[PDB]
Design a protein around this ligand. Structure first.
Ligand SMILES: [K+]
Lengths: 32, 252
C-alpha cells in the first residue's frame, strides 16, 4: 500500500541472490 | 529480544530506532515503509497512565543502524519528525486495541544497502501468510531478558499462535486487531520481544515474490518469554485503510 515499487527486497540479500542465516526457517514453517 | 541472535548487516534495513532527544534514550522500535513514513506503536508516543504524550520536537529517529551504541559513519541517518499521527480509536484504557501510529519525516531519507522500506500486505498476502504455525521475524535493540541491552541488532523468528491459545493465555480482553506469536511450553524453542522492542516490526517473507511484508507491530505482553505466555502484535492488515488514508492525505 505504500506505493514503494522496490519494497521488501533487501539490497544485501534478495538483490544479490543471497539468503540470510535464518530465513529458511520461515519457509519451512509455511510448508510443514 | 529474548533468546534471539545477532542480525547480519543489512538483514533488516527497514529497522528504525525511536529516540527521545533529551535525555538521550531509546524509546521504541519502528519501521520504514517509505522515504518519509515510519510505522510504530501508538503506546510508544501516547500513554496517559504514564503521563506520556510526545510531540514531534521531543523525538528523533535513527535509520540504517546495526550497533546499538556505536556511530556508523555515512551509513546511519538521523531524521527529525514533521508530524505524528495516532489511530483515532487507539484504546489505552483497556487492552491497547488499535496500537498503531505513523510518523512523517521532516525530509525524505535516501535509500542505501542499509536503509530500505518494507512492504505492507495486500489482501492475498494477508490471507496466505497470517496463519497459525507460520513464522514471522521480530527484530530490535530492546532488553535481552526480563530483569541487559545488546550491542548489535537482535533477531528472532516466532510462530503465529492459534487464537484460542492466545485467548486462553491471558485474562486481558483481546481483539481482532491483534494477533499473538511465540512458542508453546512443550514446543521446546523460546523467543520473545521485550522492553524497548515495542513498536518494532513483525515481518514475513513471501514465497511468491520473495518480498518482506510487515504483518505486525510489537504491541504488548505480560513479561518476556514466559512459559505459556505470548507476545501480542497489532494486526497491520486489519488497519490498512487508516494507514492508506494518512499517507494519501498528508504525504504532500
Ligand atoms: K502449508
Amino acid at each position: 500500500g505504500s506505493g514503494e515499487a522496490d519494497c521488501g527486497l533487501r539490497p544485501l540479500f534478495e538483490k544479490k541472490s543471497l539468503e540470510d542465516k535464518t530465513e529458511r526457517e520461515l519457509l519451512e514453517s509455511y510448508i510443514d | 529480544i529474548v533468546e534471539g541472535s545477532d542480525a547480519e548487516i543489512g538483514m533488516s534495513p527497514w529497522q528504525v530506532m525511536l529516540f527521545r532527544k533529551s535525555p538521550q534514550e531509546l524509546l521504541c522500535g519502528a519501521s520504514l515503509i517509505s522515504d518519509r513514513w515510519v510505522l510504530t506503536a501508538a503506546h510508544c508516543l501516547l500513554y496517559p497512565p504514564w503521563d506520556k504524550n510526545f510531540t514531534e520536537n521531543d523525538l528523533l529517529v535513527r535509520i540504517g543502524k546495526h550497533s546499538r551504541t556505536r556511530y556508523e559513519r555515512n551509513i546511519e541517518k538521523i531524521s527529525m519528525l514533521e508530524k505524528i499521527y495516532i489511530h483515532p480509536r487507539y484504546n489505552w484504557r483497556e487492552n491497547l486495541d488499535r496500537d498503531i501510529a505513523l510518523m512523517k519525516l521532516k525530509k525524505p531519507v535516501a535509500f542505501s544497502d542499509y536503509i530500505h522500506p518494507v512492504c505492507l500486505p495486500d489482501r492475498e498476502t494477508a490471507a496466505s501468510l497470517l496463519q497459525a504455525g507460520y513464522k514471522g521475524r521480530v527484530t530490535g535493540w530492546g532488553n535481552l531478558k526480563e530483569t541487559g541491552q545488546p550491542s548489535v541488532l537482535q533477531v528472532v523468528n516466532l510462530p503465529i499462535v492459534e487464537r484460542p491459545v492466545c485467548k486462553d493465555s491471558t485474562r486481558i480482553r483481546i481483539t481482532d486487531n491483534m494477533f499473538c506469536a511465540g512458542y508453546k511450553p512443550d514446543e521446546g524453542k523460546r523467543g520473545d520481544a521485550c522492553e524497548g522492542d515495542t513498536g518494532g516490526p513483525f515481518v514475513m517473507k513471501s514465497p511468491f515474490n520473495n518480498r518482506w511484508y510487515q504483518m505486525g507491530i510489537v504491541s504488548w505482553g505480560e513479561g518476556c518469554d514466559r512459559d505459556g505466555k505470548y507476545g501480542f502484535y497489532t494486526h497491520v492488515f486489519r488497519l490498512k485503510k487508516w494507514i492508506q488514508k494518512v499517507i494519501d492525505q498528508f504525504g504532500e
